[PDB]
């Protein structure tokens, strides 16, 4: 298993064997190893990486001593990669070669309080033929006296988006290590400027 942190730059498309290829561009590297997790000290294996340099005048004392115990300049974000144990102390995009498959995690776009039609693709109501103020409504939520309650997990309106989402089996399309770029074919969760994680794919 290998992973690296990154930022979603945006989408475009390239041309590869006379074929339009939609791609998302990820500024991934470079990620300093900040702490390693061993089954000795921690009970599992992982590598806490760092990403994006931070103004020292904004890094408080508990965190300063954490980076110092690794000899790493203070960084904005710290995320771990499970069961990944690199050799060096820096993880760069050259750990991905074109033609590989990756899974990408991001924070999906925040739809806020979302109705049942937008959230759950409910059919809504009719818009004519006598419908009375129910055009975007969910209809029935239960039975009658039996069971006398609404199930847990019932699909209702409420906050939708800004949650953790992972797309799987995204083809790596190109790697531009001089700019620490990573071209992935397809869509990636969340907005441009958002944070992503780019692991090896668990599909086969």
């Amino acid at each position: 298993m290998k992973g690296i942190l990154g930022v979603k730059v945006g989408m475009t498309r390239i041309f590869r064997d006379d074929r339009a290829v939609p791609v998302t561009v990820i500024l991934a590297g470079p990620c300093p190893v900040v702490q390693r997790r061993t089954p000795e000290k921690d009970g599992y294996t992982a590598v806490q990486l760092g990403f994006l340099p931070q103004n020292p005048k904004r890094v408080n004392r508990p965190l300063k001593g954490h980076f110092a115990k690794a000899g790493v300049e203070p960084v904005r974000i710290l995320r771990e990669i499970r069961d990944f144990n690199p050799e060096g102390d820096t993880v760069t995009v050259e750990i991905f070669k074109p033609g590989e498959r990756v899974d990408v995690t991001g924070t999906s776009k925040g739809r806020g309080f979302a109705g049942v039609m937008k959230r759950w693709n409910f059919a809504g109501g009719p818009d004519s033929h006598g419908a009375h103020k129910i055009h975007r409504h969910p209809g029935s939520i239960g039975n009658r006296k039996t069971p006398g309650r609404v199930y847990k997990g019932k699909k209702m309106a409420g906050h939708y988006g800004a949650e953790r989402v992972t797309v799987m089996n995204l083809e790596v399309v190109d790697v531009i290590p001089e700019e620490n770029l990573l071209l992935v074919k397809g869509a990636v969760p969340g907005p441009n400027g958002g944070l992503v994680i780019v692991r090896e794919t668990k599909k086969a």
């Binding site: 498309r13 041309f15 006379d18 074929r19 339009a20």
Partner: protein
């Protein structure tokens, strides 16, 4: 984007001029036919002494559509109408000629007779 109730101009010389799609032959519940897709239709308007006549329930292949078809090279093509060519159960054209341009998509989908007969494959 052809669905049941859609009218299509008849692109061949079978005698039919308009057909109204009643089914999309593409699995259990496909919603739409585009170029290359077989449909079942009803002859709504034919000329007299034709191989087909109004009322016939015939098969057809859609050869050009008003909605654009996209392509792997990033290009897209759209026509001024939805048109179709009437075919037999072995996918061959019941007629003798095909009027107008046809979608290149018809080639790889196995309509090489209809592509040959076309005055132009766009």
């Amino acid at each position: 984007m052809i669905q049941p109730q859609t009218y299509l101009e008849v692109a061949d010389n079978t005698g039919a001029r308009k057909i109204m799609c009643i089914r999309v032959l593409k699995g259990s519940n496909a919603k739409y036919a585009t170029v290359g897709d077989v449909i079942v239709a009803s002859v709504k308007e034919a000329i007299p002494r034709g191989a087909v006549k109004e009322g016939d329930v015939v098969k057809a292949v859609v050869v050009r559509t008003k909605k654009e078809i996209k392509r792997p090279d990033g290009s897209a093509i759209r026509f001024d109408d939805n048109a179709a060519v009437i075919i037999n159960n072995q996918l061959e054209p019941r007629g003798t000629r095909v009027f107008g341009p046809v979608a290149r998509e018809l080639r790889e989908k196995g309509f090489m007779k209809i592509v040959s007969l076309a005055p132009e494959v766009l």
